[PDB]
Amino acid sequence: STFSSLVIGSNTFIPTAPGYYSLSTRGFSDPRNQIKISGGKFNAKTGRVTAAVSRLWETDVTVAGLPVRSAAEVAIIMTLGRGITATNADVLLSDLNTLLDPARLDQILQGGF
Amino acid sequence: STFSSLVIGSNTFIPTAPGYYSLSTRGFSDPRNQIKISGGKFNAKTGRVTAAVSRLWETDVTVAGLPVRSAAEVAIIMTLGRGITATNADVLLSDLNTLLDPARLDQILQGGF
Amino acid sequence: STFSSLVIGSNTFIPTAPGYYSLSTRGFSDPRNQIKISGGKFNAKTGRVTAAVSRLWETDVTVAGLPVRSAAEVAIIMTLGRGITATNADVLLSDLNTLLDPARLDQILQGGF
Amino acid sequence: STFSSLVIGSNTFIPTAPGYYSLSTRGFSDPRNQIKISGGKFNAKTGRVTAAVSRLWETDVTVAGLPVRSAAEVAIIMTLGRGITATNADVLLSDLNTLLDPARLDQILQGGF
Amino acid sequence: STFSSLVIGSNTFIPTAPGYYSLSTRGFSDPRNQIKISGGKFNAKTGRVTAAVSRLWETDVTVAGLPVRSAAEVAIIMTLGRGITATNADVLLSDLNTLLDPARLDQILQGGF
Amino acid sequence: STFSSLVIGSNTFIPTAPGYYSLSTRGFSDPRNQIKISGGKFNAKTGRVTAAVSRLWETDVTVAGLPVRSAAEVAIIMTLGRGITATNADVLLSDLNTLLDPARLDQILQGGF
RNA sequence: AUAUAUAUAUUAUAUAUAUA
């Protein structure tokens, strides 16, 4: 609703459902490729604001000879006390995306502590 | 202590607690600056692996004229089905980091759908 | 029966069953391509005449590796109070067709409010 | 909310209520001129997505010597099985609008089969 | 997000939450400076439309030697019967703004009947 | 009681009832044109003061051929924490009256969010 | 008689399509 479109490089996401922005290429019965945004929740009790941006992707892969549609969800959840800047948030996120290369991800996905 | 250390640019994080890595500069009384990794959860019931990497940062900031220590937490939660690659995950995460610039982050944190 | 045939562009629909007009080409085992008209109903309680023109199209597509025939139905329903012209109705219909392009339709099918 | 505004020819419709887009000119006591969109509903049982776009227009006409406000509603209802494109739907809609001219519409409103 | 932006002199308000527009300068941790619009409620029972526009402003001020963040909210509630124009409303509102200068505002806030 | 009269341009309002100031032109059985002031309420619990100034106007309009007296009420409600100035109030009010022109009022009165 | 779907009013009212 509040964003007219979300652009990432070449890819352009149009808003479909409340909180939902799906790729312009993808049809309605095509595998989902989208972004979910729920944000701005704030309670005086915690003094902290909470928001969440999820990236959801589906791909058709043949596993054990059977074509199945597999899902993949990367959800970011932000909890920021008063005094924190959106810039602080992007810095922490950037730190995490730098930290997660496919090496460490394969190792963490099988159990890396 | 699967990872001996986590390096992000110049910043180096040493392991302290199980799945906890904090910056080498900081003290224990100093505000927290750290990374929590708990990953690798798999059930063949759903064929889905689930992992989480969290970034936690505290800063001493003056808010409305009063000195306060505030917390900021960006948590990534990955839920991947069979046949999704760690490369797919880094792609989706990179998409999210590119999407979240401070402008959109602020809009969403103030309530953006 | 009250329409001898319905011409739409290149295609010509002949009546088969009461209120049914299918494409002249199709054989009986071919997928259905038809128009269902039923209208003129008036109840004194509401003072509203009501009419409907449905369009039904089937196509053979492979889904989940199985060749299957799926359907697609677009139904227009007109409810008009005393003092409305058929021209008022064609104006409203034209408005809706100008409004619904494939992009907006995909959006609405994926959950558009 | 997912559409900032709907332009149709000269006229421009702004959203007022969830799923409602009325003409920007009209005041609150003026007759209603609006579009009602609600769609995206999918049930696994039928494998059919269903959506609806209604057009609602009221006008003030004297009937039986009494000035009365009467309504006129043209509702499009889309039911699409797996493997249909939004382009398939716009084609069917265009077919119906080409088909329905005022003459045929008057005929159908007066009882056309 | 019916209104893409609210402009008042030099100040520009962007939409954040449903019916919420905050100044483009401010951050989420920064004090609130915003406009809440919730309007258009109509029942034919009373023939009365009801709408509300609120202005919310926070400032960090030292009070009795202690730094405090204080809130200030001016809320307009319009209740209009059939046949009242939006022009009538702006006239009445302009009357109220002309009437409330700081002298009378202070007198009334200290208890003026 | 506390104000001897309220003057707005050419128009002069005399106090009639406690909290009530009606136009000097208007008789007692004439349509109401008045200002209601209730103000100064302050509780230590909230720390905030509340006041309210309403503008009430009635006009005779023929609707559906029947002459009816329609009401119109624009109420301002102020809630100001300690540290706020009456000048701050007039500024916020002035912002609102600048923001509400007949364009945006007609659009909000039919539902603008 | 069964199944599916849309719109109006504060559970009720109106309407379309598929199957026996």
XYZ file of C-alpha atoms (C1' of nucleotides) in Angstrom:
698
model
C 0.000 0.000 0.000
C 2.458 2.646 1.219
C 5.188 1.761 -1.330
C 4.315 2.140 -5.014
C 6.939 -0.452 -5.986
C 10.095 -2.068 -4.622
C 13.059 -2.163 -6.983
C 16.138 -4.352 -6.457
C 18.615 -4.132 -9.316
C 16.786 -5.243 -12.445
C 13.922 -6.824 -10.522
C 10.760 -4.832 -9.828
C 8.166 -5.863 -7.228
C 4.589 -4.608 -7.442
C 2.280 -4.564 -4.389
C -0.376 -7.239 -4.516
C -1.854 -7.977 -1.079
C -1.608 -5.828 2.039
C 2.020 -6.205 3.163
C 2.887 -8.218 0.039
C 5.030 -7.230 -2.954
C 5.571 -9.855 -5.649
C 7.792 -9.824 -8.712
C 6.205 -8.310 -11.822
C 7.281 -11.301 -13.935
C 5.557 -13.870 -11.746
C 1.986 -14.775 -12.532
C -0.562 -15.644 -9.913
C -0.269 -19.412 -10.371
C 3.517 -19.220 -10.901
C 5.896 -19.996 -8.003
C 5.868 -17.248 -5.406
C 8.683 -14.679 -5.481
C 7.784 -11.899 -3.083
C 8.504 -9.652 -0.095
C 6.375 -9.399 3.069
C 6.585 -6.231 5.174
C 4.907 -5.914 8.536
C 6.255 -3.119 10.542
C 6.037 -0.281 12.958
C 4.743 -2.078 16.030
C 5.565 -0.099 19.173
C 4.574 -0.628 22.818
C 5.418 1.814 25.602
C 5.967 -1.165 27.895
C 9.126 -2.382 26.147
C 9.917 1.068 24.749
C 11.073 -0.839 21.652
C 9.762 -0.885 18.079
C 9.466 -4.100 16.076
C 9.355 -4.628 12.341
C 9.820 -7.527 9.954
C 10.735 -7.886 6.295
C 10.640 -11.355 4.807
C 11.834 -12.556 1.423
C 9.916 -15.575 0.115
C 10.997 -17.627 -2.934
C 9.682 -20.839 -4.493
C 11.414 -22.994 -7.093
C 10.484 -26.178 -8.933
C 13.135 -28.876 -8.414
C 12.986 -32.587 -9.172
C 13.886 -34.497 -5.981
C 13.917 -38.314 -6.000
C 12.650 -38.032 -9.584
C 9.502 -36.198 -8.448
C 9.044 -32.529 -9.440
C 8.228 -30.628 -6.239
C 7.917 -26.917 -5.500
C 10.253 -26.043 -2.607
C 9.937 -22.919 -0.467
C 12.640 -20.678 0.959
C 12.018 -17.901 3.490
C 14.585 -15.446 4.838
C 12.919 -13.291 7.501
C 14.494 -10.227 9.113
C 13.080 -9.137 12.467
C 14.200 -5.819 13.915
C 13.773 -4.815 17.539
C 15.086 -1.311 18.202
C 14.942 0.637 21.436
C 14.382 4.349 21.376
C 17.541 6.196 20.381
C 18.439 3.803 17.568
C 18.690 5.073 14.001
C 17.519 3.450 10.797
C 21.158 3.838 9.738
C 22.218 1.711 12.719
C 19.773 -0.891 11.446
C 21.185 -0.927 7.878
C 24.696 -1.207 9.329
C 23.789 -4.250 11.435
C 21.993 -5.855 8.501
C 24.964 -5.154 6.229
C 27.204 -6.780 8.848
C 25.019 -9.892 8.753
C 24.947 -10.143 4.922
C 28.716 -9.743 4.803
C 29.041 -12.438 7.482
C 26.779 -14.902 5.639
C 28.522 -16.211 2.553
C 27.536 -19.598 1.102
C 30.428 -21.248 2.992
C 29.235 -20.302 6.474
C 25.604 -20.755 5.430
C 26.130 -24.364 4.365
C 27.982 -24.976 7.596
C 25.338 -23.271 9.775
C 22.434 -24.930 7.967
C 23.784 -28.326 9.060
C 24.297 -27.075 12.633
C 27.134 -24.559 13.047
C 27.213 -22.967 16.513
C 32.630 -22.890 18.978
C 32.300 -24.246 15.417
C 33.770 -20.987 14.112
C 37.045 -19.911 15.709
C 36.235 -16.277 14.916
C 33.845 -14.184 12.839
C 35.451 -11.468 10.736
C 33.399 -8.640 9.207
C 35.543 -5.953 7.632
C 37.889 -4.782 10.357
C 35.654 -6.066 13.143
C 36.564 -9.400 14.700
C 34.201 -11.425 16.901
C 35.495 -14.054 19.317
C 33.300 -16.855 20.727
C 32.151 -16.477 24.295
C 29.040 -18.591 24.981
C 27.599 -21.449 22.929
C 26.547 -19.839 19.646
C 27.544 -16.359 20.874
C 30.332 -14.280 19.313
C 31.091 -10.817 20.669
C 33.421 -8.111 19.416
C 36.995 -8.443 20.682
C 37.164 -4.774 21.728
C 34.227 -4.849 24.123
C 34.250 -5.637 27.799
C 31.642 -7.543 29.724
C 30.376 -4.407 31.417
C 30.615 -2.578 28.067
C 27.444 -2.591 25.916
C 26.831 -5.751 23.957
C 27.995 -6.052 20.349
C 27.553 -9.610 19.222
C 26.208 -12.318 16.931
C 24.026 -15.254 18.018
C 23.997 -18.295 15.729
C 21.646 -21.189 16.348
C 21.082 -23.223 13.260
C 20.655 -26.537 11.578
C 17.261 -27.664 12.839
C 15.820 -30.296 10.476
C 12.715 -32.493 10.564
C 11.973 -34.887 7.713
C 8.285 -34.312 8.563
C 8.333 -30.985 6.719
C 11.597 -31.524 4.815
C 12.530 -28.009 5.973
C 15.717 -26.825 7.634
C 15.575 -23.814 9.951
C 18.453 -21.631 11.089
C 18.826 -18.235 12.764
C 21.574 -15.627 12.874
C 21.037 -12.606 15.070
C 22.985 -9.355 15.379
C 22.734 -7.562 18.729
C 24.080 -4.047 19.365
C 23.756 -1.708 22.348
C 24.580 1.996 22.456
C 24.639 4.667 25.149
C 22.592 7.522 23.702
C 21.011 10.605 25.228
C 17.247 10.511 24.572
C 15.019 13.456 25.483
C 17.890 14.759 27.578
C 18.401 11.593 29.626
C 21.264 9.095 29.153
C 19.902 5.650 28.272
C 21.442 2.393 27.018
C 19.304 1.108 24.141
C 19.311 -2.224 22.330
C 19.021 -3.042 18.632
C 18.526 -6.562 17.300
C 18.344 -7.670 13.667
C 17.500 -11.380 13.469
C 17.522 -13.442 10.270
C 15.480 -16.651 10.241
C 15.954 -19.004 7.306
C 13.415 -21.695 6.504
C 14.486 -23.686 3.442
C 12.872 -26.675 1.753
C 14.592 -29.608 0.120
C 16.636 -28.591 -2.884
C 17.276 -24.963 -1.891
C 20.947 -23.982 -1.987
C 22.892 -21.868 0.460
C 23.631 -19.823 -2.649
C 19.865 -19.260 -3.012
C 19.834 -18.121 0.609
C 22.682 -15.572 0.141
C 20.898 -14.315 -2.988
C 17.669 -13.717 -1.050
C 19.518 -12.115 1.855
C 21.452 -9.860 -0.528
C 18.115 -8.899 -2.100
C 16.818 -7.915 1.342
C 19.924 -5.843 2.214
C 19.769 -4.019 -1.113
C 16.064 -3.372 -0.524
C 16.458 -2.011 3.016
C 18.117 1.379 2.763
C 17.634 3.836 5.647
C 14.736 5.622 3.902
C 12.572 2.507 3.519
C 13.754 1.196 6.887
C 12.477 4.318 8.564
C 9.233 4.291 6.632
C 8.636 0.657 7.622
C 9.640 1.232 11.258
C 7.086 4.068 11.441
C 4.472 1.575 10.162
C 4.970 0.921 6.439
C 2.948 -1.778 4.670
C -32.243 -19.162 -29.351
C -33.031 -15.424 -29.228
C -29.572 -14.765 -30.714
C -28.923 -16.672 -33.948
C -25.160 -16.413 -33.421
C -22.634 -14.334 -31.501
C -19.678 -12.961 -33.431
C -16.623 -11.864 -31.432
C -13.694 -10.865 -33.620
C -12.720 -13.861 -35.722
C -14.660 -16.325 -33.602
C -18.305 -17.264 -34.089
C -20.475 -18.837 -31.375
C -23.588 -20.812 -32.259
C -26.272 -21.766 -29.708
C -26.213 -25.343 -28.475
C -28.298 -25.517 -25.313
C -30.791 -23.006 -23.904
C -28.694 -20.005 -22.907
C -25.465 -21.592 -24.211
C -23.424 -20.411 -27.202
C -20.242 -22.344 -27.958
C -17.573 -21.885 -30.593
C -18.549 -23.327 -33.990
C -15.199 -25.098 -34.431
C -15.052 -27.169 -31.257
C -15.984 -30.800 -31.336
C -17.744 -32.449 -28.454
C -14.576 -33.895 -26.884
C -12.702 -30.611 -27.404
C -12.311 -28.244 -24.426
C -15.290 -26.009 -23.777
C -15.294 -22.462 -25.156
C -18.687 -20.940 -24.552
C -20.963 -18.135 -23.381
C -23.803 -18.634 -20.899
C -26.542 -15.989 -20.999
C -29.477 -15.911 -18.617
C -31.177 -12.730 -17.717
C -34.274 -10.661 -17.468
C -35.308 -11.705 -13.978
C -37.324 -9.004 -12.168
C -38.662 -9.151 -8.584
C -41.144 -6.497 -7.508
C -39.775 -6.511 -3.948
C -36.429 -4.966 -4.899
C -37.516 -3.307 -8.170
C -34.214 -4.563 -9.597
C -33.799 -6.473 -12.827
C -30.927 -8.942 -12.786
C -29.050 -10.597 -15.670
C -25.853 -12.590 -16.180
C -23.441 -13.283 -19.028
C -20.737 -15.846 -18.263
C -17.730 -16.738 -20.402
C -16.230 -20.217 -19.964
C -12.880 -21.344 -21.408
C -11.025 -24.598 -20.763
C -7.451 -25.391 -21.733
C -5.237 -28.472 -21.574
C -2.036 -27.752 -19.634
C 0.391 -30.054 -17.862
C 0.269 -29.362 -14.096
C 2.603 -31.061 -11.619
C 3.691 -33.328 -14.472
C 0.156 -34.542 -15.198
C -1.696 -33.341 -18.323
C -4.925 -31.856 -16.954
C -7.777 -29.751 -18.323
C -8.427 -26.625 -16.252
C -11.244 -24.107 -16.478
C -11.518 -20.318 -16.428
C -14.834 -18.508 -15.912
C -15.475 -14.754 -16.092
C -19.073 -13.915 -15.154
C -20.713 -10.497 -15.465
C -23.747 -9.938 -13.237
C -25.972 -6.899 -13.770
C -28.389 -5.634 -11.154
C -30.198 -2.478 -12.274
C -32.910 -0.465 -10.541
C -35.744 1.350 -12.222
C -34.517 4.170 -14.421
C -31.213 2.690 -15.673
C -30.384 2.358 -19.356
C -28.630 -0.494 -21.072
C -26.213 2.268 -22.125
C -25.471 2.963 -18.455
C -24.631 -0.724 -18.150
C -22.327 -0.797 -21.228
C -20.548 2.286 -19.843
C -19.903 0.548 -16.523
C -18.714 -2.608 -18.270
C -16.387 -0.585 -20.510
C -15.037 1.119 -17.393
C -14.251 -2.253 -15.837
C -12.521 -3.636 -18.964
C -10.388 -0.502 -19.318
C -9.582 -0.876 -15.618
C -8.592 -4.552 -15.721
C -5.326 -4.988 -17.570
C -3.242 -8.129 -16.963
C -0.989 -6.405 -14.408
C -3.818 -5.215 -12.145
C -5.553 -8.555 -12.658
C -2.547 -10.527 -11.537
C -2.271 -8.241 -8.549
C -5.963 -8.750 -7.652
C -5.755 -12.522 -8.180
C -2.751 -12.609 -5.817
C -4.827 -10.770 -3.166
C -5.512 -7.205 -4.333
C -7.613 -4.810 -2.234
C -4.874 0.711 -0.568
C -2.830 -1.474 -2.948
C -3.864 0.862 -5.791
C -3.081 4.527 -5.104
C -5.745 5.630 -7.592
C -7.694 4.273 -10.549
C -7.815 6.399 -13.683
C -10.580 5.668 -16.202
C -10.683 8.156 -19.060
C -11.289 11.598 -17.602
C -12.417 10.276 -14.239
C -10.148 9.513 -11.295
C -11.115 7.216 -8.407
C -9.388 7.471 -5.040
C -9.653 4.789 -2.329
C -12.003 5.536 0.542
C -12.704 2.277 2.349
C -10.885 -1.061 2.132
C -11.581 -2.325 -1.377
C -13.545 0.821 -2.323
C -12.490 3.458 -4.860
C -14.915 6.322 -5.443
C -14.803 9.295 -7.773
C -12.661 12.164 -6.449
C -15.324 14.783 -7.226
C -18.300 13.367 -5.346
C -19.208 14.722 -1.969
C -20.578 12.509 0.741
C -24.243 13.348 0.064
C -23.722 13.025 -3.704
C -24.823 9.793 -5.427
C -22.330 6.958 -5.216
C -19.937 6.361 -8.114
C -17.455 3.715 -7.098
C -15.503 0.515 -7.706
C -15.426 -2.395 -5.255
C -12.444 -4.740 -5.599
C -11.996 -7.883 -3.547
C -10.084 -10.800 -4.835
C -7.338 -13.301 -4.470
C -9.301 -15.950 -2.609
C -7.962 -19.481 -3.222
C -9.400 -22.753 -1.853
C -7.319 -25.899 -2.226
C -10.444 -28.042 -2.653
C -11.358 -26.583 -6.047
C -7.888 -25.308 -7.033
C -9.681 -22.192 -8.293
C -8.750 -18.629 -7.456
C -11.705 -16.262 -7.338
C -11.831 -12.453 -7.571
C -14.447 -9.744 -8.088
C -14.530 -6.180 -9.395
C -17.869 -4.400 -9.014
C -18.868 -1.033 -10.454
C -21.614 0.904 -8.653
C -23.373 3.995 -10.045
C -26.383 5.823 -8.615
C -28.440 8.489 -10.349
C -31.305 10.765 -9.335
C -34.290 10.321 -11.662
C -37.968 11.083 -11.192
C -39.950 7.804 -11.209
C -43.749 7.699 -11.064
C -43.645 11.429 -10.328
C -41.416 11.024 -7.267
C -37.738 12.069 -7.405
C -35.858 8.922 -6.374
C -32.241 7.758 -6.379
C -31.770 4.420 -8.144
C -28.713 2.196 -8.355
C -26.935 0.269 -11.105
C -24.323 -2.412 -10.369
C -22.179 -4.306 -12.889
C -20.067 -6.979 -11.180
C -17.335 -9.047 -12.832
C -16.517 -12.340 -11.106
C -13.431 -14.312 -12.125
C -12.953 -17.968 -11.286
C -9.717 -19.363 -12.726
C -8.172 -22.814 -12.381
C -4.497 -23.595 -12.210
C -2.702 -22.687 -15.412
C -4.703 -19.599 -16.480
C -3.078 -16.246 -17.173
C -4.371 -12.831 -16.269
C -4.093 -12.264 -20.033
C -6.575 -15.095 -20.603
C -8.900 -13.243 -18.245
C -8.500 -9.839 -19.989
C -9.197 -11.576 -23.317
C -12.443 -13.043 -21.989
C -13.480 -9.707 -20.499
C -12.718 -7.918 -23.778
C -14.814 -10.533 -25.572
C -17.752 -9.815 -23.276
C -17.513 -6.009 -23.656
C -17.329 -6.278 -27.449
C -20.331 -8.606 -27.229
C -22.492 -6.378 -25.021
C -23.644 -3.335 -26.942
C -26.730 -1.432 -25.747
C -29.053 -3.232 -28.185
C -28.120 -6.757 -27.071
C -28.108 -5.553 -23.469
C -31.613 -4.192 -23.692
C -32.680 -7.444 -25.280
C -31.062 -9.497 -22.475
C -32.491 -7.237 -19.756
C -35.959 -7.715 -21.287
C -35.479 -11.517 -21.100
C -32.769 -12.582 -23.561
C -31.687 -16.228 -23.852
C -2.500 5.926 1.476
C -5.268 7.885 -0.293
C -3.033 10.965 -0.234
C 0.472 10.473 -1.614
C 1.734 13.310 0.589
C 0.445 16.158 2.740
C 2.049 19.537 2.116
C 1.681 22.417 4.589
C 3.870 25.378 3.732
C 7.397 24.028 3.539
C 6.583 20.974 5.640
C 5.937 17.724 3.797
C 4.311 14.670 5.397
C 4.754 11.190 3.942
C 2.383 8.285 4.719
C 3.633 5.673 7.128
C 0.736 3.734 8.696
C -2.893 3.544 7.573
C -4.214 7.087 7.991
C -0.903 8.294 9.473
C 1.340 10.891 7.811
C 4.552 11.979 9.514
C 7.030 14.705 8.643
C 9.723 13.616 6.184
C 12.530 15.057 8.333
C 11.798 13.033 11.453
C 13.151 9.653 12.396
C 11.305 6.883 14.144
C 13.203 7.441 17.368
C 12.798 11.212 16.879
C 9.720 12.798 18.520
C 6.485 12.375 16.636
C 5.270 15.067 14.241
C 2.315 13.750 12.328
C -1.281 13.845 11.120
C -3.880 11.113 11.696
C -6.838 11.043 9.300
C -9.751 8.700 9.854
C -12.839 9.860 8.092
C -15.913 9.131 6.088
C -18.119 7.338 8.597
C -21.764 7.532 7.475
C -25.003 6.012 8.772
C -28.302 6.759 7.050
C -29.883 6.328 10.511
C -28.775 9.830 11.501
C -27.961 11.101 7.996
C -24.703 12.382 9.518
C -21.157 11.903 8.285
C -18.314 11.928 10.808
C -14.626 12.466 10.135
C -11.542 13.250 12.220
C -8.189 14.856 11.482
C -5.649 14.970 14.272
C -2.323 16.789 14.556
C 0.234 15.248 16.921
C 3.497 16.954 17.930
C 6.152 16.035 20.494
C 8.937 18.256 21.808
C 11.891 17.782 24.140
C 11.582 20.614 26.653
C 13.167 21.262 30.030
C 10.399 21.601 32.645
C 11.187 22.627 36.220
C 14.817 21.870 35.454
C 14.261 18.325 34.192
C 14.356 17.248 30.517
C 11.005 15.779 29.465
C 9.423 14.810 26.133
C 5.886 16.217 26.050
C 3.014 15.591 23.655
C 0.523 17.990 22.080
C -2.542 16.856 20.154
C -5.105 19.029 18.373
C -7.950 16.875 17.038
C -10.737 18.124 14.768
C -13.961 16.107 14.680
C -16.506 16.984 12.010
C -20.116 15.880 12.285
C -22.128 17.098 9.293
C -25.765 16.537 8.370
C -27.225 16.072 4.924
C -26.798 19.126 2.753
C -23.740 20.598 4.498
C -20.872 21.394 2.133
C -17.174 20.831 2.632
C -17.015 24.561 1.957
C -19.247 25.074 5.021
C -16.808 22.924 6.978
C -13.710 24.951 5.919
C -15.632 28.133 6.779
C -16.372 26.872 10.302
C -12.816 25.630 10.780
C -11.415 28.955 9.562
C -13.734 30.679 12.049
C -12.278 28.534 14.837
C -8.642 29.221 13.832
C -9.288 32.959 13.654
C -10.964 32.778 17.068
C -8.163 30.841 18.781
C -5.213 33.177 19.152
C -2.638 32.404 21.866
C -4.270 34.788 24.373
C -7.689 33.103 24.296
C -6.065 29.681 23.961
C -4.190 30.243 27.181
C -7.215 31.646 28.952
C -9.274 28.610 27.908
C -6.507 26.133 28.781
C -6.348 27.654 32.284
C -10.122 27.044 32.541
C -12.025 29.589 30.435
C -15.788 29.256 29.947
C -19.149 33.855 31.524
C -15.412 34.605 31.460
C -15.452 36.190 27.965
C -17.592 39.300 27.491
C -17.940 38.591 23.760
C -16.221 36.650 20.982
C -15.550 38.579 17.787
C -14.632 36.949 14.463
C -14.330 39.445 11.626
C -17.690 41.167 11.311
C -19.510 38.566 13.392
C -19.997 39.107 17.121
C -20.984 36.318 19.530
C -22.622 37.110 22.863
C -22.566 34.629 25.777
C -25.909 32.991 26.377
C -25.601 29.762 28.384
C -22.636 28.618 30.458
C -19.998 27.645 27.877
C -22.176 28.921 25.015
C -21.695 31.977 22.789
C -24.234 32.527 20.016
C -24.306 35.058 17.204
C -25.944 38.378 18.082
C -28.075 38.266 14.918
C -29.624 34.896 15.699
C -32.822 34.822 17.689
C -33.675 32.119 20.153
C -35.953 30.191 17.789
C -33.688 30.879 14.780
C -31.212 28.208 13.600
C -28.320 27.832 16.007
C -25.039 29.572 15.156
C -22.780 29.337 18.178
C -19.518 28.375 19.890
C -19.168 25.942 22.817
C -16.119 26.221 25.083
C -15.347 23.688 27.767
C -11.842 23.863 28.923
C -9.107 23.676 31.459
C -9.490 20.097 32.636
C -6.246 18.853 34.186
C -5.402 15.608 36.003
C -2.046 14.931 37.646
C -2.340 11.321 36.502
C -1.912 12.087 32.794
C -0.043 15.330 33.481
C -1.962 16.662 30.462
C -4.579 19.406 30.143
C -7.662 19.017 27.957
C -9.882 21.643 26.404
C -12.481 21.779 23.658
C -13.910 24.490 21.429
C -16.763 23.545 19.144
C -18.379 25.535 16.360
C -22.036 24.649 15.781
C -24.066 25.850 12.762
C -27.578 25.070 11.525
C -29.033 25.878 8.114
C -32.421 25.353 6.493
C -32.083 23.400 3.229
C -34.756 21.727 1.125
C -33.750 18.073 0.598
C -36.008 15.759 -1.429
C -38.408 18.715 -1.615
C -38.765 18.811 2.183
C -37.362 21.817 4.094
C -35.180 20.414 6.885
C -32.808 22.083 9.336
C -29.381 20.423 9.051
C -26.675 20.624 11.710
C -22.919 20.974 11.322
C -20.422 20.644 14.177
C -16.667 21.180 13.976
C -15.139 20.322 17.359
C -11.523 20.982 18.338
C -10.127 18.939 21.222
C -6.731 19.864 22.624
C -4.627 17.594 24.801
C -1.382 19.263 25.865
C 1.274 17.889 28.176
C 3.094 20.181 30.527
C 5.714 22.223 28.699
C 3.481 23.021 25.727
C 2.644 26.628 24.897
C -0.640 28.124 23.779
C 1.387 29.343 20.793
C 2.263 25.730 19.952
C -1.466 25.049 20.009
C -2.342 27.906 17.602
C 0.441 26.727 15.281
C -0.911 23.168 15.156
C -4.449 24.437 14.628
C -3.257 26.781 11.877
C -1.511 23.805 10.257
C -4.799 21.893 10.278
C -6.875 24.767 8.803
C -4.297 25.256 6.066
C -4.377 21.505 5.384
C -8.186 21.367 5.164
C -9.371 23.078 2.011
C -12.724 22.116 0.468
C -10.935 19.730 -1.933
C -9.422 17.507 0.752
C -12.516 17.910 2.930
C -14.849 16.570 0.249
C -12.447 13.716 -0.318
C -12.046 12.927 3.405
C -15.770 13.228 4.113
C -16.392 10.343 1.696
C -13.567 8.302 3.259
C -10.062 9.624 2.542
C -7.362 7.859 4.579
C -31.359 -31.942 -3.084
C -25.950 -31.054 -2.895
C -21.270 -28.105 -3.987
C -18.760 -23.287 -5.210
C -18.694 -17.810 -5.651
C -20.086 -12.425 -5.387
C -22.554 -7.907 -3.472
C -26.020 -5.106 0.486
C -27.828 -4.449 5.893
C -27.173 -5.219 11.442
C -27.220 -13.110 12.019
C -30.641 -11.408 8.101
C -31.647 -9.915 2.663
C -30.625 -10.062 -2.693
C -27.956 -12.411 -7.070
C -25.020 -15.524 -10.429
C -22.670 -20.415 -12.013
C -21.499 -26.088 -11.698
C -23.512 -31.353 -10.305
C -27.539 -35.082 -9.420
